[PDB]
Amino acid sequence: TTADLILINNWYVVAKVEDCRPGSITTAHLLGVKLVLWRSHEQNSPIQVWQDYCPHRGVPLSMGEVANNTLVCPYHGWRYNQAGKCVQIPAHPDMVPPASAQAKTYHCQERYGLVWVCLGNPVNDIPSFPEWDDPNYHKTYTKSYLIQASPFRVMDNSIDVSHFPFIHEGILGDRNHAEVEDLEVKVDKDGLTMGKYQVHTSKFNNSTKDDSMVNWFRLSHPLCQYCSTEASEMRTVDLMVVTPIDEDNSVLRYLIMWNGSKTLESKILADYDQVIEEDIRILHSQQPTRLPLLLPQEIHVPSDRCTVAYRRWLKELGVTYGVC
Amino acid sequence: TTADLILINNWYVVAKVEDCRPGSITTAHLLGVKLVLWRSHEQNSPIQVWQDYCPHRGVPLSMGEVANNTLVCPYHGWRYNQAGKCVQIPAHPDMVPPASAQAKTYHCQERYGLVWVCLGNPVNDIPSFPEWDDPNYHKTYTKSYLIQASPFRVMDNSIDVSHFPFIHEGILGDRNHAEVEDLEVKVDKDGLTMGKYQVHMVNWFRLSHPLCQYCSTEASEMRTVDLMVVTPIDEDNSVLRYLIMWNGSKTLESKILADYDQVIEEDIRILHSQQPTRLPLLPQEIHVPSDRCTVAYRRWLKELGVTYGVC
Amino acid sequence: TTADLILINNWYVVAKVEDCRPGSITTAHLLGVKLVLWRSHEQNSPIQVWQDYCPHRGVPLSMGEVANNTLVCPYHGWRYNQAGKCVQIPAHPDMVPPASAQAKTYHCQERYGLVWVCLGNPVNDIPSFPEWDDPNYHKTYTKSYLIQASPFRVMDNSIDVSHFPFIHEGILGDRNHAEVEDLEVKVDKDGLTMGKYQVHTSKDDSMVNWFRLSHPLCQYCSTEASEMRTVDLMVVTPIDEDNSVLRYLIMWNGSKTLESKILADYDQVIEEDIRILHSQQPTRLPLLSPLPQEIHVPSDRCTVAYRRWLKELGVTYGVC
Numbered sequence: 030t031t032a033d034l035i036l037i038n039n040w041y042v043v044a045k046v047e048d049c050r051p052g053s054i055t056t057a058h059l060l061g062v063k064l065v066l067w068r069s070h071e072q073n074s075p076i077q078v079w080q081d082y083c084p085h086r087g088v089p090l091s092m093g094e095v096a097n098n099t100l101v102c103p104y105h106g107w108r109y110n111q112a113g114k115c116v117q118i119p120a121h122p123d124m125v126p127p128a129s130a131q132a133k134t135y136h137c138q139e140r141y142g143l144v145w146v147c148l149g150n151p152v153n154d155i156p157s158f159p160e161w162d163d164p165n166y167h168k169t170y171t172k173s174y175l176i177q178a179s180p181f182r183v184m185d186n187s188i189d190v191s192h193f194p195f196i197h198e199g200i201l202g203d204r205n206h207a208e209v210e211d212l213e214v215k216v217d218k219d220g221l222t223m224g225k226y227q228v229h230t231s232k233f234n235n236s237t238k239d240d241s242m243v244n245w246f247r248l249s250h251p252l253c254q255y256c257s258t259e260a261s262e263m264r265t266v267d268l269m270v271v272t273p274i275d276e277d278n279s280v281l282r283y284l285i286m287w288n289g290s291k292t293l294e295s296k297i298l299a300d301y302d303q304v305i306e307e308d309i310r311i312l313h314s315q316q317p318t319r320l321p322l323l324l325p326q327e328i329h330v331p332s333d334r335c336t337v338a339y340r341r342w343l344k345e346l347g348v349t350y351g352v353c
Numbered sequence: 354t355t356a357d358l359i360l361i362n363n364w365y366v367v368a369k370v371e372d373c374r375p376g377s378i379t380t381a382h383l384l385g386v387k388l389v390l391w392r393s394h395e396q397n398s399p400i401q402v403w404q405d406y407c408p409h410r411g412v413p414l415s416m417g418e419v420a421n422n423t424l425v426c427p428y429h430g431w432r433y434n435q436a437g438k439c440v441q442i443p444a445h446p447d448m449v450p451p452a453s454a455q456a457k458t459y460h461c462q463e464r465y466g467l468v469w470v471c472l473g474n475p476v477n478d479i480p481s482f483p484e485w486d487d488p489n490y491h492k493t494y495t496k497s498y499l500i501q502a503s504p505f506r507v508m509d510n511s512i513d514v515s516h517f518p519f520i521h522e523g524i525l526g527d528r529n530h531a532e533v534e535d536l537e538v539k540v541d542k543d544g545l546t547m548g549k550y551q552v553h554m555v556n557w558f559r560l561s562h563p564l565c566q567y568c569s570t571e572a573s574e575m576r577t578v579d580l581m582v583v584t585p586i587d588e589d590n591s592v593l594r595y596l597i598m599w600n601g602s603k604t605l606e607s608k609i610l611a612d613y614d615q616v617i618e619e620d621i622r623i624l625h626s627q628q629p630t631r632l633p634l635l636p637q638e639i640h641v642p643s644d645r646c647t648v649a650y651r652r653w654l655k656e657l658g659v660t661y662g663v664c
Numbered sequence: 665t666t667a668d669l670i671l672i673n674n675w676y677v678v679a680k681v682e683d684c685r686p687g688s689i690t691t692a693h694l695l696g697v698k699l700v701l702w703r704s705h706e707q708n709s710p711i712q713v714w715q716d717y718c719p720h721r722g723v724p725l726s727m728g729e730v731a732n733n734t735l736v737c738p739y740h741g742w743r744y745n746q747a748g749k750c751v752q753i754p755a756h757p758d759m760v761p762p763a764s765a766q767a768k769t770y771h772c773q774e775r776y777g778l779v780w781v782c783l784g785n786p787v788n789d790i791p792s793f794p795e796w797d798d799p800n801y802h803k804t805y806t807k808s809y810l811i812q813a814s815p816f817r818v819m820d821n822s823i824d825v826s827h828f829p830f831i832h833e834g835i836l837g838d839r840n841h842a843e844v845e846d847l848e849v850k851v852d853k854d855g856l857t858m859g860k861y862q863v864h865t866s867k868d869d870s871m872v873n874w875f876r877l878s879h880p881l882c883q884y885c886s887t888e889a890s891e892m893r894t895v896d897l898m899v900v901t902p903i904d905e906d907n908s909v910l911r912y913l914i915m916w917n918g919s920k921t922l923e924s925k926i927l928a929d930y931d932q933v934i935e936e937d938i939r940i941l942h943s944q945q946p947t948r949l950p951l952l953s954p955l956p957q958e959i960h961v962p963s964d965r966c967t968v969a970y971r972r973w974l975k976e977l978g979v980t981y982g983v984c
């Protein structure tokens with residue numbers, strides 16, 4: 030696994046907690062590793078996140094089953110406890126299993142209804158999300174988007190604001206109001222922050238004044254973005270998380286929170302989906318698929334300030350995976 | 354071919370005789386070599402097994418036609434006799450074909466209703482199957498199974514008895530009778546033999562060579578034997594076939610075949626998912642005593658010098 | 665593009681002009697390079713051929729739109745003029761695009777109703793085609809044929825003459841007339857020429873055929889039978905080392921009503937060849953030496969000369 034240590038020792042989302050019911054077995058991929066996630070049948074059981082590989086004969090444990098608080102390999106029925114230790118070999122039921130019969134386990138935390146995994150030793154905290162515990166804000170989750178592009182391209186595109194009047198034409202501007210005001214970007218001890226920024230939206234409802242939004246966002250780590258939007262009657266926040274499948278593939282998910290009417294959920298999710306799929310069309314075709322750090326090399330203009338700072342930040346962090 | 358010499362000089366099943374009719378052209382793939390099988394229209398004509406490659410311009414001979422005891426390439430019509438010598442170049446009908454105009458031919462034998470092929474020099478005869486000569490036993494053939502796993506993984510899985518109660522629950526074991534008694538396994542000059550052992554019915558098997566297995570199962574009222582043959586397509590792909598014989602009622606045939614198909618499909622589900630796809634010889638695999646037969650098999654392949662399809 | 669320099673500096677066909685309508689955007693692939701072809705909405709606007717690549721963030725320009733004689737990238741709306749210089753950055757509409765905001769453009773010429781492209785610097789003219797301005801000749805074009813074989817294999821198979829009786833039986837021969845007369849073949853500074861020879865059909869049942877390649881992927885073929893003459897220009901697009909596009913421009917001085925019969929005969933013969941070409945191993949064309957891979961008998965004289973000519977030119981792309 031060629032991921033840089035700075036990536037291995039971070040937290041990434043691999044699933045939503047609501048898709049991982051008691052007694053379930055789920056698969057995911059993170060930084061090139063196959064993972065199995067499983068839970069015992071008890072209510073509120075913790076989630077285990079292991080490499081999807083039985084030490085006996087290399088069969089995926091995800092093809093087995095959960096029984097009596099153990100994951101059971103389908104091939105010879107070896108049973109692994111929550112710590113990943115083999116505690117029973119059915120062929121020799123009075124034999125202590127070899128101390129080497131042990132799954133490779135990883136760190137797992139549930140936070141914000143999401144399943145966070147660290148494949149290494151977590152040097153960092155899970156990013157913060159201040160509105161999570163605020164009862165004035167409702168919450169919803171997008172579907173997960175599988176995207177054939179580097180996770181760092183996915184985050185680069187989400188930090189770029191100048192493309193709004195073109196590929197989000199009709200939602201976030203139009204081709205003839207495309208000028209980009211000066212941008213305020215900082216890379217410091219809190220990571221990358223984009224200062225408050227006006228976005229002219231296209232009018233949809235002519236009875237109402239132009240719902241002009243003001244955005245700002247912070248990245249405390251390069252594959253997770255906290256975004257704040259103020260409209261005329263409402264504040265919307267989201268936690269955008271990118272799962273780095275490998276160097277060339279990503280999963281994109283949003284946790285969205287807003288303090289307007291709960292009835293807005295359907296419209297919020299449909300509007301995110303329309304924006305994300307427009308982005309995915311560009312991401313899928315971008316050349317090369319990995320993000321070039323500072324084919325001709327990419328040109329930069331003043332409105333690229335944000336994405337330029339992002340690329341510099343990645344070089345400072347020693348990122349070599351998913352970039353070129 | 355780049356398979357090890359020990360594998361090159363052994364016999365492998367590549368087809369059923371019933372599929373090689375007089376006049377026919379069929380193909381197979383063995384140890385990375387594409388093969389053409391063909392027969393003249395004479396009744397009882399022999400089967401030729403050649404590399405599927407016309408040496409003029411590299412077109413598959415299997416796209417050709419069998420005319421007058423010759424195989425005819427479709428591109429320029431060069432005609433090859435039963436020994437694979439080019440005997441006619443139509444562009445120059447008076448010319449004697451040069452000596453290099455020769456198909457690459459291989460050894461072929463029909464035995465037990467199957468087409469056996471040796472790509473090198475057969476130093477063995479075809480493995481024995483005693484019940485073929487016993488008219489008290491009926492016979493049937495499974496269909497062939499194309500498996501995306503190393504052939505040595507396929508054979509390794511078939512000798513590993515401890516998985517029976519877990520993935521063959523109902524035909525070869527009970528999840529409540531999963532304990533495995535002391536296995537007796539012996540690797541000889543006669544190959545690998547597993548001693549008689551009880552299945553919850555007594556079973557034993559012998560492999561005279563790494564990819565052919567003879568297996569014998571005795572119930573209270575009936576004996577069943579089969580010859581299990583693995584075609585090594587290449588390092589990562591196999592064809593599996595069984596010749597099954599039994600001395601019980603002949604009406605049991607469809608049940609027997611159903612049982613085999615169910616057991617094979619359960620095995621394929623596991624084989625397809627196993628990693629790596631090639632059989633590791635001796636993270637690494639762990640061994641408990643009920644791995645006795647599978648460890649002995651891996652040691653045998655290592656002793657034999659097998660490097661194709663392994664590790 | 666790891667293509668040899670002698671390939672990069674030659675001309676190749678990448679489209680028919682009828683495929684490139686005013687205002688259109690189409691794509692092509694040449695020697696590993698992805699191409700965008702586009703035209704203004706004006707009638708008889710010139711054709712631009714560029715690398716399919718926006719220099720800003722690497723989006724294919726082929727996903728854009730033609731507007732006001734410019735190609736507009738869809739990502740951030742930069743506009744490139746017919747020379748491929750960026751003329752407008754909409755985020756900074758009063759700013760002058762940096763000099764580096766320039767598409768990678770290629771040489772393009774329309775000739776014989778075909779779009780010719782040179783990725784490097786042209787050292788030759790587009791091949792000559794004498795009958796193009798003869799008003800006694802009608803013209804027609806085949807469709808384009810994508811072939812999963814090296815373009816040198818495609819060209820090799822079309823100068824092979826001894827296979828006509830076998831895979832083209834009923835159109836270019838039959839198995840009762842499979843014997844090949846002596847072949848006149850000359851390779852020199854001006855390419856490969858095959859002298860007149862007799863093709864059997866259904867004096868007698870025959871045509872006389874010759875052909876010439878001034879360059880290794882373009883062939884001029886001439887066939888005469890009973891006062892009617894057919895010529896064609898066969899052009900192979902080298903997509904990469906393992907893939908190609910085949911096109912024909914056909915001209916003939918007989919009845920106009922032969923057009924659809926000519927097209928069907930060409931199509932049948934081409935599909936018969938593709939069946940062979942897709943089965944051949946290796947995919948790339950094997951050159952000559954310093955179970956045999958290849959054997960050569962006297963009727964192979966023209967394909968042997970072709971292989972020798974390719975080594976002499978220094979071709980390593982698409983051969984082996």
Ligand SMILES: N=C1N[C@H]2[C@H](COC(N)=O)NC(=N)N3CCC[C@]23N1
Nearest residue numbers: 187244254256258267269300301304
């Ligand atoms: N994390 C992010 N959520 C999005 C919010 C929600 O609005 C929509 N429609 O997605 N709006 C917005 N302008 N930013 C900048 C890029 C897209 C996004 N980034």
Ligand SMILES: N=C1N[C@H]2[C@H](COC(N)=O)NC(=N)N3CCC[C@]23N1
Nearest residue numbers: 511524556566568579581612613616
């Ligand atoms: N050569 C072999 N044939 C197969 C048959 C399957 O039996 C039934 N009843 O389907 N019998 C048997 N004991 N096994 C163990 C593994 C697979 C197999 N080995």
Ligand SMILES: N=C1N[C@H]2[C@H](COC(N)=O)NC(=N)N3CCC[C@]23N1
Nearest residue numbers: 822873883885887896898929930933
């Ligand atoms: N340049 C060439 N065009 C093709 C046409 C095919 O003729 C017809 N009637 O379809 N004519 C011809 N002599 N040949 C032989 C090789 C393929 C081809 N070479």
Ligand code: FES
Nearest residue numbers: 083085086102105
């Ligand atoms: S492979 Fe998992 S128990 Fe044997």
Ligand code: FES
Nearest residue numbers: 407409410426429
């Ligand atoms: S390739 Fe077989 S005869 Fe020419």
Ligand code: FES
Nearest residue numbers: 718720721737740
């Ligand atoms: S990528 Fe083409 S304008 Fe930005």
Ligand SMILES: [Cl-]
Nearest residue numbers: 069070097098
């Ligand atoms: Cl449980």
Ligand SMILES: [Cl-]
Nearest residue numbers: 176177309313
């Ligand atoms: Cl995608």
Ligand SMILES: [Cl-]
Nearest residue numbers: 393394421422
């Ligand atoms: Cl015959």
Ligand SMILES: [Cl-]
Nearest residue numbers: 500501621625
């Ligand atoms: Cl499979």
Ligand SMILES: [Fe+3]
Nearest residue numbers: 186192197308
């Ligand atoms: Fe976007």
Ligand SMILES: [Fe+3]
Nearest residue numbers: 510516521620
């Ligand atoms: Fe099994």
Ligand SMILES: [Fe+3]
Nearest residue numbers: 821822832937
């Ligand atoms: Fe042909």
